[PDB]
RNA sequence: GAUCAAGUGUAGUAUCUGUUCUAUCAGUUUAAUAUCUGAUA
């Protein structure tokens, strides 16, 4: 998921994550990561030094998207304009970093 | 919010202003740009083959193909100094990318301006101010470049027209009466568009540290230096000089600025401030240099900065850092 | 005279300037004084030196000659030079 | 002991060194960290030191009425109507014994 | 006087430069480790986790300025 | 300005009167002096 200032897991089975950047995330748990298609490692198994544990990331699995909170940190540029011929001018917000960064456009109303 | 995707961290955008399109510039450090993230993954498929070699084989023509998202799994992380950069053309209607502009690994773009040329009339520029190898901390930097593009296409294509090098970062480019005003580290310039390369018209070295910002109104320059807050420079037309005319009295670790009037200038810092400073009534703008050296030698600024002073007529701390200001 | 007033208002010290003809001022906040006198002031004219502020406390001829060497390649180099504008083809 | 007294920059040395020679004072070759003194002493908006602190005598060994008081209603406007603000000193412009003897509308006005 | 001493950072006649900036440096790194704003800024900028931020910042209050003068 | 003696007064800080200051070097010390400690007359 994306990289976390905090998360928290709630005893209904939801984890709460809340994004370093950008929109923060609830997620159901809908396993508790008891599957065994993915192995397991531990600090019992032989290994070297410099040597490492190998996994594959993948697609959501344990977790399902149930809500997102629509996050302007960081605003890292802005201009207010009309640029759509709109009565109001819109706000044009530049945000997020690196890969979940957006151009955001704010109007004054509701979706 | 309607949101559109971005590929690396947006730094700055500019509108263009007969078709409203944003030119947008995205850059980021520890960054990987296509062309050397597809090289990455060409040699390390080869390295894989290259350490059981039929499955192998098979094992990195599936990582070649195995393509996770870099929204969700984040962007891999290159090197400390390393940077990914790029240039977008973007309607703000609907977020469609018009156009994109990949720059060169270790190339950051920190810089762009739309502008017109005095020489070239109509003709609509894009000028980008790239750092070439910077690495932050400590800092240091191999120079940096100018790239100019001709505006085209109603203003949804950048026509590549030359790449212009530079002693230092160009942390700020803002056009200044038919022609374009770039910082370079301490120095601010004034470049003509020439038709290989910029063409340096005018220099002024007297500004105390590197140049983050340039706001512009009439003749008058306002110079957000990093550390050591607002300069104000007037342009002497007939004499092509650059002249500091007043300072603030105090450091400020600015982000951005923004005109209020002809003398006021709301600014921001990394210290999440917000600050006023205007000129006090009957500061004179017409000021000379001296073509032999007596006013840096006998005549004089005052406390170590320029003859005239910026009064702080606002302070306030917003509890949190603003790089946006604008009046409206 | 009264006599605290070589010792404790220290003009028992004493001090040359090159500059001066080699001339001598006695004590210290008396002698500081002579950067803005008519001695000092034709040394620095016989060596073609301005009396800047820069050239306070310098009481030594190839001192006062080195650091006008330094200054006046820092105050060539501060300001624009316009022989260093740029024309197309380029020319400066 | 002496030695160390004698282990330092000449005048001339310290000069030639820093990017300001004219802050530079007679003085400023026995301290501790010349070139740390002279850097402060060179930086954009710093004060310097009280003039006096090498003076033999203690610092000063060696009023009017303001107009709009001197000009019940009277008194309250002398406060609220007519009151101008003095010749003010900028910062660092220290006292010392001898100191004496494109349109132009103002944004967030009323 | 006496009690500011109870206070580490402060100086006397006889603090060196090293002293002085390797106090800068130090009560620098917890203010930025303390706003969250000004922590925010250095992450962007270096496209770095705030956690990893932190720890750097965290390993620089050791020997901020390099060693002690000699 | 430093420095020695004496009177007087206060919670504390001091005031006030009568003296000394006449040559160079070294050490101590100081921002630089000076004082101080030795040496040469
Ligand atoms: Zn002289």
Redesign the interface.
Known sequence: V??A?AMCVLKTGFLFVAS??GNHYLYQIAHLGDDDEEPEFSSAMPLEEGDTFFFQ?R?LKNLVLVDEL?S??????????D??NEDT??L?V?????????????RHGLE | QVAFPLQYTPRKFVIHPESNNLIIIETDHNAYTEATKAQRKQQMAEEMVEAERELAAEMAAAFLNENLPESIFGAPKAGNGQWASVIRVMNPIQGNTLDLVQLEQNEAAFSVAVCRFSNTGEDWYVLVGVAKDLILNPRSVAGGFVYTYKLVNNGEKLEFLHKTPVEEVPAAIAPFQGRVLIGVGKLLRVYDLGKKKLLRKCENKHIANYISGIQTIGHRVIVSDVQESFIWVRYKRNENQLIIFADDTYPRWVTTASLLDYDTVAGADKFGNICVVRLPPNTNDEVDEDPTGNKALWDRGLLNGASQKAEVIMNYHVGETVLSLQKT | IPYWLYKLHGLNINYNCEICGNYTYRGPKAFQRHFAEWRHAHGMRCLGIPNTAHFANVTQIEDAVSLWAKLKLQKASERWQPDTEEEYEVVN | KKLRRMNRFTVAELKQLVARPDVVEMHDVTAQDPKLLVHLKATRNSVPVPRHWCFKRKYLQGFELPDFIKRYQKLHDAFFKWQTKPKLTIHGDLYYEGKEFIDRTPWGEL | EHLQSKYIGTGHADTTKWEWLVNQHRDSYCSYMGHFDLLNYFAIAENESKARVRFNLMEKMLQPCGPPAD
């Open positions: 994306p990289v200032a370093e950047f990331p697609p629509d302007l940190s960081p605003i890292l540029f802005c201009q207010i304009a640029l759509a001018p819109q044009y530049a945000c997020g970093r690196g890969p979940r960064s957006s151009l955001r456009v704010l």
